[PDB]
Amino acid sequence: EVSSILEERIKGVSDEANLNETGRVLAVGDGIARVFGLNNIQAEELVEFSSGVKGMALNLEPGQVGIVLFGSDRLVKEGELVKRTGNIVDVPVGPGLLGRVVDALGNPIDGKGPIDAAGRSRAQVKAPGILPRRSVHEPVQTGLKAVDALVPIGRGQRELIIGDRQTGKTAVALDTILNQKRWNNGSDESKKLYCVYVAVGQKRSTVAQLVQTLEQHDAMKYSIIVAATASEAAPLQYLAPFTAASIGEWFRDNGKHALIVYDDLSKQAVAYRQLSLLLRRPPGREAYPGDVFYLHSRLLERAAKLSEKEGSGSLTALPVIETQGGDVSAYIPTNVISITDGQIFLEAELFYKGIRPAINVGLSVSRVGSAAQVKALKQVAGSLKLFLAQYREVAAFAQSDLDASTKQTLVRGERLTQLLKQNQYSPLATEEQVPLIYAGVNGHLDGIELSRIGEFESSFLSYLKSNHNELLTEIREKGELSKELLASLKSATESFVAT
Amino acid sequence: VRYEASLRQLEQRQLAKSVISRVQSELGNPKFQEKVLQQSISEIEQLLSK
Amino acid sequence: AKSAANKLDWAKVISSLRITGSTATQLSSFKKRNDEARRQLLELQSQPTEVDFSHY
Amino acid sequence: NVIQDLYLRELKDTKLAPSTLQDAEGNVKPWNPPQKPNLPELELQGPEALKAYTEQNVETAH
């Protein structure tokens, strides 16, 4: 009992040490121990103090090496041996991180078990070249019709999620993982997206809810949750996306696919600000380092859909940037906006108007496009974009007397807006994405009252399954919409509108 | 269950002050001498092995 | 069962229409309705008596 | 070496004994057996009711 624990603990200090190169603290202030020694010292090398804390050495000054502490100053005191671990920051990579909430070092903070790892690989690894890359054909499906069709996303792709926190910023991200559960079931490991959620500056109480939610929806078993909490030190926060990416490279390398969602790189920036200011390295615009751009570029360009040269595998990424007014002007947004391909712009107005989580999809864009979209889903959702496009313009005359054309647009558009509403943690199969957009396109939703859109949806889907889940199964398996199948589908929808 | 777990933690803390007591025993005795001598010869053994 | 009672009751709302009143159609309906919904949730509140006195 | 000495002495000579069962009992919710599921009485008793149904109902009019 207490004894079993004692034996373990004593075993854990059994086997005498034998020191080598040390440094000694001259003075320690503000997480910047200034150490005399460490003559040889790799850059970004891990050094372990005699207070046991670990550090990296961002300033290698000529006669003293200004270590950056990954922890509290209380532990450190003057004249403290600072052993040189002699290993650049590395984190385990391997399948053992699957279903594990780990700290940056890789220690399971959920304590679900030690990481099975085939290597520990260094935190910052250079981006894969031009010729290692290949065009993205594979779509990634979030089970949200609007995201999958209006903002078509693939695998390898890096695309922004700029929006305001707690509007279910995390919820939008989580929804994808759940629809990816479907794909995960699908044997191929380009369909097994082993997702990585990088929780930056997020309190343990919140992250406890997240972990539990993932487990609830039984998705925490191909998940990895890299946790750098609000209180967790700024080196850990800074290197947390970098180290996390290295895990991602292992999946990508193995030809598998995975999705890494960095939430929020804004707090990664803030941590770097703390580091830089304390290292006296000048803070850039808005007191946020200027080579934060350089960091973001290195991190985000490791996300790639590889070619068969390096095996066709990928590392999808979805960085999340938190805005306080939608101020894209702000230095950290401007930089990230430039680096990312596509943007998702989630907006408050919609939230109030009952779309929760709320996305303004007029101000969302894709710059990777429908090449990462199902052919079927593309076919029956070109129309949708145009109707909605008109709807935006003709929403600016909606509030009376209106030409029939304008009024018609409003009828289809209001029904569509209601259909595109979605509530947290509801993923929806592609074989049910394809029918719903078709109905709206054919204006079959127009007749069924706005309030009755909700009723229409569930009923329509069940009716489609009853009438022809053969048709639905054809949509899924063929992956393409044969004219005969859309003919039948059109008839089916008409029949459903009738009852 | 709650108090049982609390009692188990309390036992570790009770034994923690006992560890401190046992440390004081090392530092007084001519274990203080004998084991320092052991460290000296151990240091010799390691350092000759370098 | 209890749902049969209420189903017959709503037929009787339109039967009590064929005569006068429904002032005690409502007294019957309210009584059966209340206890049906309450007992359905009472029975869902009930968890078998026993706890893991082996685990714990 | 030092580890072995410290351990040997410490573990061997230090093994705590728990507090009283009374003290343990104080810090926990003990248990006592709930009683009574509720006993109500038979609804709307007697021929007061029988007369009430017969007499009261005649709820038809022109």
**Whether A455 contacts A424, CB under 8 Å:** no
Which has the closest alpha carbon to A318: A157, A114, A84? A157
The pairing of beta strand A119-122 with beta strand A90-93: antiparallel
D19: helix, strand or coil: coil
The verdict on a CB contact (< 8 Å) between C20 and D61 is: yes
Region class of D14: left (phi > 0), else alpha (psi between -120 and 50), else beta: beta
Which has the closest alpha carbon to A101: A173, A171, A181, A204? A204
**DSSP letter, residue B29:** S
CATH topology of domain A15-87: Elongation Factor Tu (Ef-tu); domain 3 (2.40.30)
Mutate to test the interface with B, among D1, D4, D10 (most CBs of B within 10 A): D10
Deposited resolution, Å = 7.1
The verdict on a CB contact (< 8 Å) between B22 and D13 is: yes
Quickly count: other Cβ atoms within 10 Å of residue D18's Cβ.
12
Q: Yes or no: is domain A374-499 CATH 3.40.1280.10?
A: no
Distance CA A219, CA A213 (A): 9
**How far A109 CA lies from chain B's nearest CA (Å)?**
19
Q: Do chains D and A touch (3 or more CB pairs under 8 A)?
A: yes
The sign one gets for the Cα dihedral A83, A86, A91, A95 is negative
- What is the SS3 string spanning chain C? CHHHHHHHHHHHHHHHCCCCCCCCHHHHHHHHHHHHHHHHHHHHHCCCCCCCCCCC
Binding site residues of A, as ranges? 163-170
Taking only residues 13 to 72 of chain A, the set having a beta carbon closer than 8 angstroms to any beta carbon of chain B reads 16, 18
Contacts of A207 (CB under 8 A, 6+ apart): A101, A199, A225, A227, A229
Show residues of chain C in contact with D60, CB under 8 Å.
19-21
**DSSP letter, residue B30:** T
D32: helix, strand or coil: coil
**DSSP letter, residue D50:** H
Distance CA A250, CA D9 (A): 48
Q: Residue A201 has which token pair?
A: 């500056």
CB contact B8 to D (< 8 Å): no
Quickly count: other Cβ atoms within 10 Å of residue C28's Cβ.
14
Which helix (H) or strand (E) segment holds residue D21: the answer is helix D21-26
CB contact D28 to B (< 8 Å): yes
The verdict on a CB contact (< 8 Å) between C20 and D57 is: no
Side-chain half-sphere exposure of C47, counting CA atoms within 13 A: 2
Residue A4: closest C-alpha in chain D: D11
Distance CA A320, CA A176 (A): 14
**Whether A142 contacts A179, CB under 8 Å:** yes
**Whether A167 contacts A174, CB under 8 Å:** no
**Is residue A367 annotated as a catalytic residue, yes or no?**
yes
* Angle between helix A453-478 and A483-498 (nearest 10): 160
Q: Do chains C and D touch (3 or more CB pairs under 8 A)?
A: yes
Q: Map out the domains of chain A as residue ranges.
A: 15-87, 88-373, 374-499
C-alpha of A229 from chain center: 16
Distance CA A358, CA A350 (A): 5
Beta bridge partners of C11: none
CB contact C48 to D (< 8 Å): no
Show residues of chain D in contact with C19, CB under 8 Å.
59-60
The sign one gets for the Cα dihedral A449, A450, A455, A460 is positive
Which has the closest alpha carbon to A152: A305, A373, A343? A373
**DSSP letter, residue D18:** P
CB contact B13 to D (< 8 Å): no
Touching A (3+ Cβ pairs <8 A), the chains are: B, D
Quickly count: other Cβ atoms within 10 Å of residue A245's Cβ.
26
Binding site residues of A for ATP, as ranges? 163-170
Quickly count: other Cβ atoms within 10 Å of residue A219's Cβ.
19
Quickly count: other Cβ atoms within 10 Å of residue A19's Cβ.
9
Distance CA A463, CA A438 (A): 15
Which has the closest alpha carbon to A164: A287, A272, A266? A266
Q: Of residues A158, A367, A415, A476, which has the active-site annotation?
A: A367
**Whether A175 contacts A344, CB under 8 Å:** no
The sign one gets for the Cα dihedral A52, A230, A206, A292 is negative
Taking only residues 24 to 43 of chain B, the set having a beta carbon closer than 8 angstroms to any beta carbon of chain D reads 25-26, 31, 35, 38-39, 42
Beta bridge partners of A322: A163
Side chain identity at residue A261, one-letter code? V
CATH topology of domain A88-373: Rossmann fold (3.40.50)
CB contact D3 to A (< 8 Å): yes
Using CA atoms, how far residue A314 sits from A121, A191, A297, A303, C16, in Å, is 18, 11, 18, 7, 71
Using CA atoms, how far residue D1 sits from A456, D5, D6, in Å, is 77, 6, 9
The verdict on a CB contact (< 8 Å) between B46 and A2 is: no
Q: Is A373 exposed, middle or buried, given 0-12, 13-18 or 19+ CB atoms closer than 10 A?
A: buried
**How far A18 CA lies from chain B's nearest CA (Å)?**
8
Q: Residue A308 has which token pair?
A: 């068969």
Distance CA D16, CA A70 (A): 37
**DSSP letter, residue D27:** T
Distance CA A316, CA A157 (A): 5
CB contact D7 to A (< 8 Å): yes
The pairing of beta strand A224-228 with beta strand A100-102: parallel
Contacts of D60 (CB under 8 A, 6+ apart): C19, C20, C21
CB contact C24 to D (< 8 Å): yes
- What is the SS3 string spanning chain A? CHHHHHHHHHHCCCCCCCCCCEEEEEEEECCEEEEEECCCCCCCEEEEECCCCEEEEEEECCCCEEEEECCCCCCCCCCCEEEEEEEECEEEECHHHCCEEECCCCCECCCCCCCCCCEEEECCCCCCCCCCECCCCCEECCCCHHHHHHCCEECCCECCEEECCCCCHHHHHHHHHHHHHHHHHCCCCCCCECCEEEEECCCHHHHHHHHHHHHHCCCCCCCEEEEECCCCCHHHHHHHHHHHHHHHHHHHHCCCECEEEEECHHHHHHHHHHHHHHCCCCCCHHHCCCCHHHHHHHHHCCCCEECCCCCCCECEECCEEECCCCCCCCHHHHHHHHHCCCECECCHHHHHCCCCCCCCCCCCECCCHHHHCCHHHHHCCHHHHHHHHHHHHCCCCCCCCCCHHHHHHHHHHHHHHHHCCCCCCCCCCHHHHHHHHHHHHCCCCCCCCCCCHHHHHHHHHHHHHHHHHHHHHHHHHHCCCCHHHHHHHHHHHHHHHHC
Using CA atoms, how far residue A316 sits from A64, A180, A361, A377, in Å, is 41, 13, 21, 20
Q: Is D38 exposed, middle or buried, given 0-12, 13-18 or 19+ CB atoms closer than 10 A?
A: exposed
Side-chain half-sphere exposure of A276, counting CA atoms within 13 A: 19
Backbone phi, psi, residue A431, to 5°: -70, -10
Distance CA C29, CA C26 (A): 5
Quickly count: other Cβ atoms within 10 Å of residue C8's Cβ.
11
Distance CA A492, CA A446 (A): 16
The pairing of beta strand A320-322 with beta strand A161-163: parallel
**Whether A358 contacts A341, CB under 8 Å:** no
Which helix (H) or strand (E) segment holds residue D20: the answer is none
Distance CA D43, CA A259 (A): 65
CB contact C27 to D (< 8 Å): no
The verdict on a CB contact (< 8 Å) between C23 and D60 is: no
CA–CA–CA angle C41, C42, C48 (5° rounding): 115
Long-range contacts formed by A355-360: CB under 8 A, 24+ apart = A355/A417, A355/A420, A355/A421, A355/A422, A356/A167, A356/A168, A356/A423, A356/A424, A357/A167, A357/A168, A357/A169, A357/A171, A357/A172, A357/A422, A357/A424, A358/A167, A359/A146, A359/A147, A359/A163, A359/A172
**DSSP letter, residue D59:** -
Which has the closest alpha carbon to A469: A439, A492, A448? A492
Side-chain half-sphere exposure of A209, counting CA atoms within 13 A: 7
Distance CA A275, CA A57 (A): 11
Using CA atoms, how far residue D62 sits from A39, D10, D58, in Å, is 112, 101, 12
Quickly count: other Cβ atoms within 10 Å of residue A177's Cβ.
25
Region class of A134: left (phi > 0), else alpha (psi between -120 and 50), else beta: beta
Which letter, b or e, does each residue of A62-74 get, where b requires 16 or more Cβ atoms within 10 Å of its Cβ?
eebbbbbbbbeee
The verdict on a CB contact (< 8 Å) between A16 and D3 is: yes
CB contact C49 to D (< 8 Å): no
Distance CA A259, CA A193 (A): 6
C-alpha of A24 from chain center: 41
Beta bridge partners of A199: A227, A263
